[PDB]
Write a structure and sequence with these properties.
The protein is an alpha/beta fold and 653 residues long. The protein has four domains: 179 residues, 3-Layer(aba) Sandwich (Rossmann fold); 177 residues, Rossmann fold (3-Layer(aba) Sandwich); 143 residues, Four Helix Bundle (Hemerythrin (Met), subunit A); 86 residues, no CATH class. 41% of the residues lie in helices and 17% in strands. It contains 26 helices and 23 strands. The strands form five sheets. An eight-stranded mixed β-sheet has the order 4-3-5-2-6-7-1-8, with helices on both faces. Strands 9-16-13-10-12-11 form a six-stranded parallel β-sheet, with helices on both faces. A hairpin with a 4-residue loop joins strand 17 and strand 18. Helix 16 packs parallel to helix 22. The longest helix is centred in the C-terminal third of the chain and has 21 residues. The relative contact order is 0.08. It is classed as splicing. Keywords: spliceosome, RNA splicing, Bact complex, DEAH-box ATPase/helicase, Prp2, Spp2, splicing. It forms a monomeric assembly. Cryo-EM structure of the DEAH-box helicase Prp2. The protein is PRP2 isoform 1.
């Protein structure tokens, strides 16, 4: 029974003591551990009272991850026994699955409640707001904690709830005028922690052996959790795991593999949240802790390599590179505590104990100290915050981080010479995307050398959001089926969606060209969001007049698109050299990047070899044993650099 397992959670004994503490205090900090029923059961408790209204107000619950916000919202819709999106909803950056006048409690990302301040600055739609996993200290949470502190004198009726770990709840108390702290402790069972003998390279090889030693010799039921560092490694480990499982057959036992990553099908969302039968051993592959929580929570084994992917800040250029780093000592200890929720557990760590003591860091650094603040500062200037380091944030950014982020906003055109937001900067805040993607859609409709290609650029920007999950198999075998001798990666993404339109968006088209069909329905959905915002801004009407007056149905129409991305991304330009590709930027002598093997520019140099290009634009940088470049674009001539961004590129050339 899913109704009686709710009463066995640790928060239920504190239920009546919670609610009387909410009615007295405006802000309350709820100390505890993740998955103790804080995030799940407190929204049902506040709706059982009159905290919202009969139907007038709402409850907003903030999750730091995208997949945590969707998966917990479906799990609550089971316990509420309502259809997801009718009384219980979620609001992701391109998914708004909420009825406008029926949703009572909705679970949104931390970045998506920052967007809510733009339309409604006092947050008049919500009754109470709960900030879950505030101890993780993301960038969008840290700004939102600072923004909510301003409007607390200005609105007395609202209730604010900060959920955090036991270690960090005192820092939030000093920040909120000596706010009272309520403690809902998790039931702690003894977890045994195993450190391996030597330092272990190729942790995914060691992890497969660790699963099988658990699965054969340990009695049912106790389930296995493996923390994998990314979304691609979960699928590679899953596919490898049935290969060994098919070899055994029904000889020893049964193994059910359950992945948890972003944008799973609805058939997979049910399979995560169901009890295993007898003689069935569930193995769960996830990335973070907050997705793994569940009401019955039969899982009793945890395997922890100790790595996490982060978007570490790059000093030379403005943006971040996707970098995998060792987890902090506080984060590793929280992963070991996942085992002992219902019974005693065992934690197998793929790193030695000497690395646990000396090599690891004690507390993770806040995300605001090493990031690109451009999307934040543009939102803070748009919202009325005129002073940048006077704002009441609990941790302040670096001054060279903020100087680099302000001068990247000035070159992008979102700020004046004084530092005020301009009409373009007000325009970039309307679009539900990065400000550099908004500059490309602005250049495509307005710029005198570039106008007329907004409909093509809306296609390419929608494709760049869903790039890693576009195609099944190798890219080149899918690329040559679609269109041959494609020089740059952005033009390839334009051709796939255009031909998919011409087949009336059919499923049968995508199997024949080896493209994931569920991805393309996400890409078409992103385009519908970006097109409605372009009408509301008015770029669509300006696009049609530029199209009605000038029509290039020739090789210019892909030259104009190339110019639109140089104005949007002038910092992501790479120059060919004797040593190799090298970042253009004047702050550094060289970064010595290289092309990632998946992108089409690597294919053109290796197979049917063409001459390498002198200048190349990219969308994403990463450091996996050397610097890699994805979503390439060939800039065939120097003059497009000096024409489009003369501020940077007259110095360089």
């Amino acid at each position: 029974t899913i109704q009686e397992a709710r009463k066995l959670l640790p928060v239920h004994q504190y239920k009546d003591e919670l609610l009387q503490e909410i009615k007295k205090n405006q802000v309350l900090i709820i100390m505890g551990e993740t998955g103790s029923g804080k995030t799940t059961q407190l929204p049902q408790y506040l709706v059982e009272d009159g905290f919202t209204d009969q139907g007038k107000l709402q409850i907003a619950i903030t999750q730091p991850r995208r997949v945590a916000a969707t998966s917990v919202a479906a799990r609550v819709a089971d316990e509420m026994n309502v259809v997801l999106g009718k009384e219980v909803g979620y609001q992701i950056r391109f998914e708004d699955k909420t009825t406008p006048n029926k949703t009572v409690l909705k679970y949104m990302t931390d970045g998506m409640l920052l967007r809510e301040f733009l339309t409604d600055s006092k947050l008049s739609k919500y009754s109470c707001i709960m900030i879950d996993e505030a101890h993780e200290r993301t960038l969008a949470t840290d700004i939102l904690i600072g923004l909510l502190k301003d409007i607390l004198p200005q609105r007395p009726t609202l209730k604010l709830l900060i959920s955090s770990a036991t270690m960090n709840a005192k820092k939030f108390s000093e920040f909120f005028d000596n706010c009272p702290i309520f403690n809902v402790p998790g039931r702690r069972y003894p977890v045994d922690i195993h450190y391996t003998l030597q330092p272990e390279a190729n942790y995914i090889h060691a992890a497969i052996t660790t699963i099988f030693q658990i699965h054969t010799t340990q009695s049912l039921p106790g389930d296995i959790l493996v923390f994998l560092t990314g979304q691609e490694e979960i699928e590679r480990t899953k596919t490898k795991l049935e290969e060994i499982m098919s070899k055994l057959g029904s000889r020893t036992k049964q193994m059910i593999i359950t992945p948890i990553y972003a944008n799973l099908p609805q058939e997979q969302q049910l399979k995560i949240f169901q009890p295993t039968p007898e003689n069935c051993r569930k193995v769960v592959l996830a990335t973070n802790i907050a997705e793994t929580s569940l009401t019955i929570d039969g899982i009793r084994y945890v395997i922890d390599p100790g790595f996490v992917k982060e978007n570490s800040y790059v000093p030379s250029t403005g943006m971040t590179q996707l970098l995998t780093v060792p987890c902090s000592r506080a984060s590793v200890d929280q992963r070991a505590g996942r085992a002992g929720r219902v019974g005693p557990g065992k934690c197998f760590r793929i790193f030695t104990k000497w690395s646990y003591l000396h090599e690891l860091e004690l507390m993770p650094k806040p995300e605001i100290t090493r990031t690109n603040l451009s999307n934040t500062v543009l939102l803070l200037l748009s919202l009325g915050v005129t002073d940048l380091i006077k704002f009441p944030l609990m941790d302040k950014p670096s001054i060279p981080t903020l100087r680099k982020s302000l001068e990247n906003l000035y070159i992008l055109g979102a700020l004046n010479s004084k530092g005020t937001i301009t009409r373009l900067g007000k325009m970039m805040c309307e679009f539900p995307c990065e400000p550099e993607f908004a500059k490309v859609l602005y250049t495509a409709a307005t710029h005198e050398q570039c106008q007329g290609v907004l409909e093509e650029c809306l296609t390419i920007v929608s494709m760049l959001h869903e790039t890693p999950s576009l195609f099944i198999g190798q890219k080149r075998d899918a690329a040559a089926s679609v269109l041959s001798e494609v020089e740059s990666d952005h033009i390839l993404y334009l051709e796939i969606f255009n031909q998919w339109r011409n087949s009336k968006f059919s499923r049968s088209w995508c199997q024949d060209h080896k493209i994931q069909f569920k991805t393309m329905l996400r890409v078409r959905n992103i385009r519908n969001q970006l097109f409605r915002c372009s009408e509301k801004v008015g770029l669509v009407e300006k696009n049609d007049q530029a199209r009605m007056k000038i029509g290039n149905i020739a090789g210019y129409i892909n030259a104009r698109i190339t110019r639109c991305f140089i104005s949007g991304f002038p910092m992501n330009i790479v120059q060919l050299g004797p040593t190799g590709y090298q970042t253009m930027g004047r702050s550094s002598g060289g970064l010595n990047v290289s092309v990632h093997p998946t992108s089409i520019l690597f294919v053109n140099h290796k197979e049917k070899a063409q001459r390498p290009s002198k200048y190349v634009l990219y969308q994403q940088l990463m450091l996996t044993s050397k610097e890699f470049i994805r979503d390439c674009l060939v800039i065939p001539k120097e003059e497009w650099l000096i024409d489009m961004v003369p501020q940077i590129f007259k110095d360089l050339i």
